[model samples]
Target: MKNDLIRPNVLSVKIISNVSPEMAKKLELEPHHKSLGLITADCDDVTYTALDEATKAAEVDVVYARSMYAGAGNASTKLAGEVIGILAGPSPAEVRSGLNATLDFIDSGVGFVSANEDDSICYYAQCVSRTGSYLSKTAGIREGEALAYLVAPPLEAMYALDAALKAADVEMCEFFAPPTETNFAGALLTGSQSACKAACDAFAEAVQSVASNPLGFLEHH
Candidate 1:
């Protein structure tokens, strides 16, 4: 059964043993790629980590990696989930090898944890032990730097980012604007593992504060 509230979870995984040349052209894949591995998950940025990890496990190429607009809450297809990550390879075995790695990596609990058990509010306030190919390239940081990928709703994200910066020695590496493809806001921060972890903890606390008192400003009379 699907969880009523949103959480970090794999939405779907699919593999095509062979894709026709016509379809391959439409997919804009390289001529060498004959098999495809497709994956989707509730979390966009975090899932990209797993997809990048897959490339290391097998000879595959990331042909497609994009998130739907308006976020998962407004997804047009359930299986489409929020993001689509496609890995293409010369043979089905190679595609399978990559997809299998994605499952295992994500299964190890890599995404965000729920802020509260009873609420649907979700956020990612964790430190990546080491930056991966996907994030490092996107954020222009070194591949092995300790990075913080933080996300929350618009107001909460902006507010928490301030808290995160003040609480640690981390530097903001990249800033994702509000109303992103997922309709969320976040930033990438890089520093020592300890600094990133502290920033993450402080960010989480600020998110919790905003969630718990969304109307705190109303009491300023």
Candidate 2:
């Protein structure tokens, strides 16, 4: 249960190839013994493992493998290396559900705030690695990566919101839910309302620093 709470998810798809020498030359990985025409191709270690296990229940349909379309040093393969042993290398759908569960756990918890209040919202997003591992070897992270980048309460934006709301003579004491054993709820919700404005201000500083005119994209929208 504890392990489940901490891991991310992964995703995968099926692929096959008949051109061995060409594919090996391209991927630069050592080639296995030559098998006639029906060798599996794009299936990663995880997907190939599943296909091997489910041989009785399903049939493998080999697809034409092309070399030109493949990216150098597969990004998906590199990402999967980080996610092994966490996702059990499940199918795409199972990975999605696991990730969604992690998202729910993270979004509603103390992770909404910075471990150190001065840090930006991006810093709090450390939990996402586990979520990525849970989803599948190929999928990106979604859970605990700290709700940063608009996922949770951003410090600058939240601060600005709190300040603006206060300046407007609004009684903003309980904008978010009160803290409970599991979370700091109210403040988080309140921050959600204000953080955007604060983020805009921070952004404006950067844009205005260069441009003489202020289009004010940071101030509104």
Candidate 3:
């Protein structure tokens, strides 16, 4: 009944809660960053299936497959593939040569020189400092090193989905229709057990919250 229900057209925001192990493995191998490439990479069919099921359950126009990073352009993908091919026993000179060759597109590291850069530097610095402080009290990792553990694991998954979802052309949404919609069976946003539970619980309550009051859905209009 609050005024936060203004709906916009966007891809659904649901997540597939219980990501399959097979999917997790594929994501591990095919990280989102174009800088890291593996031979014989393929989409995780397990996650894909889960996403499909989620879409049906959510009764939306389209389901999304998201990664954390922007898609690597064709040139970057090619350059990455070549780099990974030579990672074994490659000299630092070779690595630097390969990396500098793609310097025009290397936007992955941590640094700054502008307002955006300043924000990033501060954001990352704060995140890193706090993360380090937390880990020192628990994992005993060094100050800067703690960030490596916190960021590295999820970074790939985040980037991969961000890139792939755009490529997949899934529809996004900024509003909620009734779960009992006429096309509810054909929902476009749903997730696996974990994601489904999270979505359904959140969504069911959100809908119920506005179901009362005659001015419910109209409040945002």
Candidate whose lDDT is highest: 1
lDDT of each model, Cα atoms only? 0.82, 0.27, 0.24
Taking all chains together, each candidate's TM-score versus the true structure is: 0.82, 0.19, 0.17
Q: Candidate 2 residues 187-216, lDDT tens each?
A: 211123234234323332322222333233
Q: What tens digits encode model 3's per-residue C-alpha lDDT throughout 42-95? A: 111112222222222222111123221221122234322111111111223333
The lDDT ranking, best first, is 1, 2, 3
Candidate 1 is scored at a TM of 0.82
Highest-scoring model, TM-score: 1
On lDDT, who's better, 2 or 3? 2
Q: Per-residue lDDT tens digits of candidate 1, residues 1-221?
A: 11132446789988898998889988988889999998898778778878777776788877889988877778878787788998999998999999898888877766665565566666787677775566677778876678888998899899999999999899988898898898789899989999999999999888888877787876653
Q: Is candidate 1 or candidate 3 better by lDDT?
A: 1
- The C-alpha stretches of model 3 lying farther than 4 A from their native spots are 1-186, 217-221
